[PDB]
Design a protein around this ligand. Structure first.
Ligand code: CHL
Ligand code: CLA
Ligand code: CLA
Ligand code: CLA
Ligand code: CLA
Ligand code: CLA
Ligand code: CLA
Ligand code: CLA
Ligand code: CLA
Ligand SMILES: CC(/C=C/C=C(C)/C=C/[C@@]12O[C@]1(C)C[C@@H](O)CC2(C)C)=C\C=C\C=C(C)\C=C\C=C(C)\C=C\[C@@]12O[C@]1(C)C[C@@H](O)CC2(C)C
Lengths: 197, 42, 212, 153
């Protein structure tokens, strides 16, 4: 499905069946098919978590600057005092993430294994493809068409690099992302990476 | 040039080219960042 | 009409009376058998070296133009303080390092498309298709195209294609040497090329390289 | 202050070592004219020495009674930059090399006479294989899980 470098050919292991299959495997990582179907899931989950992360560390900032709601800037957001401790959050984020991630693990190991509740055994999940559970993960029931999966993976690949840009625009700049965007739009030819270094 | 690229592909010529490039890299790094004993960049 | 016919074996050589090498039959433009060392033995690499010569010559031609024409305008009184070998040190916006990375991005796109042409000819095709019309398959380095052959001079309209490509290559080899002269005699004289020309034309005998 | 070592920005013996080396360089600097080239090289070495000692001060190095930067390689986060952050940076690069030279050896393993590619390295094949080892850790991980890392004899 398309090609990322027209001078290069899509490898034989990327047949275009998968969503987002522009043939980008220059370093031959998904050459074994097991690695391919594992890295599909790793891409989907890193991209979905990156979308949530970017949306949770940028949208706070574009609302802080305009003054709609004041909220911290994602790096001074840890040191704030919350209704629990700094580690209690880690305890909960371990207890009820181990359960959901090991069930996703059992799904990406064998697909039809884990779809019904432990407690309410009637409320099963439909037999969707791996990495796309559906059911209560689809309450509005927007269809998982291949174009939608491609849109998912594209926004996710974009949000991953956006998070990387955030980490490196706080590691060697010191300021937030949206402040860096306003600094770029102030004078684009004088507020870039090749002025900081 | 045919059969010169095969000679330059040979293990000693290729090793001296690789290690000359690598040694120049290390040498210029030590010029840029001399006297290093820690990695403080994190 | 458009075949890229080569030069004959009894063509003019760089060194008359000498034997041209067997890997310079004449398929390339500007083939005069220049190979004292024989760097174009492997034809799969001689193709890359022909593309290298072509692009090198085109850049050298645009460069010698951008050196001598603007110096003529400076002598005419259009541009101030012009000196090509100090025109990178002088002031612009964007610090000359933001300019460099923007240049590398844009020229990376352009030269990457050209690279994809070189590795596999039909990958990056341009001159968009039209119904019931066939755009001719071009050669590497001479894409033709609506963007690079808008006057349709490449398929052999005013002159044949071989003599026009030979014109490109010979004019451009001359420009490559002109730019080498620029890069050498602007540092061993620390002066202007056109100034050096008028200085040698003043007294050709004693105003040569041996004075300095 | 681990292992009974004062930090190097606070150690008097470290500053004494700095001053001793600086005086040793200045005593060699007097013999040359202040504008001459040996003198300028000695002065550049003097600033190099001064900023070297300042950088060993600021990077948390610990100095002993002898007054020399000791490396705490145990695992304390304050000194990861002494051993572990370089060490990973070694195991990456080293594991690049071995993952490249191994992969190359697997790519020229299926030739007729595969020994004439050991001594005459296929630069195109080697250049294709070299950057495969950029993200080598995931390839080695998966090949360990897929069993392709260990030959089955
Ligand atoms: C992923 C992830 C990333 C990239 C960071 C990044 C950071 N956290 Mg952090 N955290 C992350 C997950 C989590 N954090 C926290 C709770 C905290 C706290 C309580 C603090 C950080 C701090 C930090 C900083 C450490 C230097 C850095 C900005 C520190 C900081 O922001 O200092 C100003 C800090 O005090 N994080 C929780 C809940 C347990 C997480 C899950
Ligand atoms: C979590 C990271 C991650 C993972 C696991 C994948 C995994 C995959 N991608 Mg995706 N991709 C990502 C991020 C990721 N991608 C991002 C950020 C981009 C934009 C730069 C892309 C752009 C992209 C395209 C355009 C295409 C793929 C394709 C693929 C598949 C084959 C390549 C492969 O196995 O890579 C495995 C990758 C890794 C193990 C990640 C290594 C990351 C290192 C540590 C960082 C290197 C950068 C560093 C920060 C500097 C596979 C499903 C192809 C596909 O759809 O085939 C089905 C395809 O056409 N990807
Ligand atoms: C994923 C993800 C994660 C891990 C976080 C994590 C956090 N968010 Mg963010 N957020 C996200 C997505 C995410 N957000 C998205 C997608 C939106 C939209 C927001 C909008 C948002 C607001 C408006 C606020 C937070 C706040 C917070 C903090 C407290 C949340 C809580 O439980 O109390 C915490 C750092 C709060 C905060 O930091 O201030 C107390 C806060 O006011 N978030
Ligand atoms: C995801 C896309 C994305 C976008 C839109 C931006 C946008 C911006 N970045 Mg960020 N950045 C990104 C990714 C991105 N960056 C990544 C992946 C890295 C890590 C290599 C960085 C590291 C970085 C630094 C260190 C700095 C910026 C800065 C900037 C600003 C000026 C541009 C510049 O200096 O070019 C730098 C651009 C790059 C190094 C790579 C861009 C590649 C993207 C993915 C292509 C998008 C098209 C601008 C707001 C500067 C700032 O704060 O102002 C600045 O100092 N960026
Ligand atoms: C095995 C024992 C050993 C060890 C551990 C060291 C360790 C060290 N020596 Mg000693 N040395 C040794 C043996 C050893 N040496 C021997 C045998 C000799 C005699 C030949 C010397 C002679 C010697 C001298 C004369 C000097 C050192 C110096 C150094 C320091 C190196 C600083 C440097 O340039 O690296 C900097 C780092 C590099 C060069 C690695 C760069 C690698 C490249 C750029 C790739 C990395 C990026 C990569 C892409 C990954 C990025 C991640 C991601 C984005 C992809 C370091 C403390 C120097 C020093 O500072 O003194 C303390 C110095 O002046 N050593
Ligand atoms: C970018 C430079 C460049 C390149 C790659 C080529 C490539 C080619 N030329 Mg062209 N040529 C050039 C510049 C170049 N030429 C210039 C400047 C002149 C005029 C002086 C000519 C005049 C010329 C003639 C008359 C003919 C060719 C021919 C050829 C082909 C065979 C030779 C070969 O493979 O050499 C490969 C060359 C290189 C890889 C470049 C050499 C690089 C090394 C390191 C030496 C550089 C140092 C140099 C000697 C410094 C000059 C010193 C100064 C005092 C003069 C090949 C397509 C023959 C042909 O068939 O035409 C198509 C032919 O008959 N060339
Ligand atoms: C090889 C192609 C090439 C390259 C890299 C340059 C590069 C440059 N030219 Mg030149 N130029 C070229 C071809 C080229 N020019 C041609 C073909 C013409 C006709 C000109 C006419 C021209 C003028 C009239 C001027 C430049 C100037 C400049 C500088 C700023 C351009 C911006 O803005 C820069 C050094 C400007 C400058 O700052 O020169 C000092 C300037 O005044 N160029
Ligand atoms: C992982 C994502 C990824 C990466 C790393 C690249 C990287 C690249 N692309 Mg590709 N591309 C991608 C995704 C990607 N692309 C996708 C998803 C599409 C849509 C199908 C394209 C369509 C595309 C075209 C059509 C072209 C590139 C080109 C290029 C090159 C730009 C040269 C440069 O550095 O300019 C700064 C570079 C090698 C250009 C190139 O040089 O191709 C060889 C070019 O013409 N790309
Ligand atoms: C004066 C030197 C010269 C000559 C004789 C040619 C001759 C040719 N070029 Mg080349 N070319 C040159 C310089 C030259 N070019 C330079 C400097 C560049 C870089 C911008 C190019 C880039 C280029 C491309 C990208 C293409 C050609 C094409 C062509 C062909 C048709 C156009 C034509 O007749 O140009 C006539 C030239 C002039 C009358 C010169 C005056 C123009 C003034 C300065 C304006 C022909 C073989 C096309 C081709 O072969 O298509 C099949 C093609 O695709 N050339
Ligand atoms: C999951 C993710 C980010 C998740 C972020 C989250 C939850 C953020 C949460 C927070 O911010 C909030 C909301 C609020 C703050 O108060 C708290 C924190 C906690 C800070 C990023 C993944 C980020 C992942 C990244 C950047 C991955 C990049 C990978 C690339 C470029 C891969 C390239 C290649 O692998 C291919 C594709 C194919 C190979 O063949 C070739 C090569 C070239 C090797």
């Amino acid at each position: 499905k398309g090609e990322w470098l027209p001078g290069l050919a899509s490898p034989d292991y990327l047949t275009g069946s998968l969503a987002g299959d522009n043939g980008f495997d220059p370093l031959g990582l998904a050459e074994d098919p097991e690695n391919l179907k594992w890295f599909v899931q790793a891409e989907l989950v890193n991209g979905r978590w990156a979308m949530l992360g970017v949306a949770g560390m940028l949208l706070p900032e574009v609302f802080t600057k305009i003054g709609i709601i004041n909220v911290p800037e994602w790096y001074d957001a840890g040191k704030e005092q919350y209704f629990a401790s700094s580690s209690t959050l880690f305890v909960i984020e371990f207890i009820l993430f181990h359960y959901v991630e090991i069930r996703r693990w059992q799904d990406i190991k064998n697909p039809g294994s884990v779809n019904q509740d432990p407690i309410f055994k009637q409320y099963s999940l439909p037999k969707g493809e791996v990495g796309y559970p559906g059911g209560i993960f689809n309450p509005l029931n927007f269809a998982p068409t291949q174009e939608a999966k491609e849109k998912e993976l594209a926004n996710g690949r974009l949000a991953m690099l956006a998070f990387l840009g955030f980490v490196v625009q706080h590691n060697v700049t010191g300021k937030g992302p949206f402040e860096n965007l306003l600094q770029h739009l102030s004078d684009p030819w004088h507020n870039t990476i090749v002025q900081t270094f | 040039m045919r059969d010169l690229k095969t000679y330059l592909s040979v293990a000693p010529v290729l090793s001296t080219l690789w290690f000359g490039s690598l040694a120049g890299l290390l040498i210029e790094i030590n010029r840029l960042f001399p006297d290093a004993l820690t990695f403080p960049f994190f | 009409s458009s075949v890229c016919e080569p030069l004959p074996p009894d063509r003019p050589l760089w060194f008359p009376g000498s034997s041209p090498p067997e890997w310079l039959d004449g398929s390339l433009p500007g083939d005069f058998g220049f190979d004292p060392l024989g760097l174009g033995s492997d034809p799969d690499t001689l193709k890359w070296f022909a593309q290298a010569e072509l692009i090198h010559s085109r850049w050298a031609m645009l460069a010698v133009t951008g050196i001598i024409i603007p110096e003529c305008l400076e002598r005419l009184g259009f541009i101030e303080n012009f000196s090509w070998y100090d025109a990178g040190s002088r002031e612009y916006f964007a610090d000359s390092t933001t300019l460099f990375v923007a240049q590398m991005v844009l020229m990376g796109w352009a030269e990457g498309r050209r690279w994809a042409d070189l590795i596999k000819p039909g990958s990056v095709d341009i001159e968009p298709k039209y119904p019931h019309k066939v755009n001719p398959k071009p050669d590497v380095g001479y894409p033709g195209g609506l963007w690079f052959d808008f006057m349709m001079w490449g398929r052999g309209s005013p002159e044949p294609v071989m003599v026009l490509r030979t014109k490109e290559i010979k004019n451009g080899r001359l420009a490559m040497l002109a730019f080498l002269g620029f890069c050498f005699q602007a540092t061993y004289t620390s002066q202007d090329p056109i100034e050096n020309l008028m200085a040698h034309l003043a007294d050709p005998g004693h105003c040569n390289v041996f004075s300095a | 202050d681990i292992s009974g070592l004062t930090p190097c920005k606070d150690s008097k013996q470290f500053a004494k070592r700095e001053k001793q080396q600086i005086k040793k360089l200045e005593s060699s600097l007097k013999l040359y004219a202040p504008e001459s080239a040996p003198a300028l090289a000695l002065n550049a070495q003097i600033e190099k020495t001064k900023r070297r000692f300042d950088n060993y001060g600021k990077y948390g190095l610990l100095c002993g009674s002898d007054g020399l930067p000791h490396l705490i390689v145990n695992g304390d986060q304050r000194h990861w930059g002494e051993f572990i952050t370089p060490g990973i940076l070694f195991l990456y690069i080293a594991g690049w090399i071995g993952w490249v030279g191994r992969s190359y050896l697997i790519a020229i393993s299926g030739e007729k006479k595969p020994a004439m590619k050991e001594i005459i390295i296929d630069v195109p094949l080697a250049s294709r294989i070299i950057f495969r080892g950029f993200i080598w850790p995931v390839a080695a991980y998966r090949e360990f899980l897929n069993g392709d890392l260990i030959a089955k004899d």
